[PDB]
Amino acid sequence: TLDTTWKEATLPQVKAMLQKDTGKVSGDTVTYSGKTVHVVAAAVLPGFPFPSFEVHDKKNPTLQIPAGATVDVTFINTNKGFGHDFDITKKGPPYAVMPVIDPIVAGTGFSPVPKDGKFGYTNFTWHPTAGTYYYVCQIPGHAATGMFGKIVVK
Ligand SMILES: [Cu+2]
Incomplete structure (x- = not known):
């Protein structure tokens, strides 16, 4: 049920996509x-x-x-x-x-x-229920050394 479909993007395409995030930054929160x-x-x-x-x-x-x-x-x-x-x-x-x-x-x-x-990227959709979640990388050692962040759905 994980997303295992990766599209190819050049660097300009990557940048364009990064700029499409719709959040607003305050402190260390988006x-x-x-x-x-x-x-x-x-x-x-x-x-x-x-x-x-x-x-x-x-x-x-x-x-x-x-x-x-x-x-x-x-x-x-x-x-x-x-x-x-x-x-x-x-x-x-x-x-x-x-x-x-x-x-x-x-x-x-x-x-x-x-x-x-070229860089791999993917898109998936999530319909969260209120709570605190984390986005994490599972490559051995990565999360243990800081590769994660928090998601507050409220
Ligand atoms: Cu990682």
């Missing part, structure tokens, strides 16, 4: 509003620390999403040498080297490692 919201996350953008996810040009920010919203997530793997995944779970940190995060409520399989000047 707040979304409206009936449908579009989260665009990337794994380790240039200039950002490994390992981390970036959303709206912030490092592992907390995503604030309205209860009742349909969440369209775009996940892009911009990180050379790694096939990061993006999985949403109720299980919080700290994470084991091999995270035990079932059930995964929405998310992806492992992404392709970047190649041919």
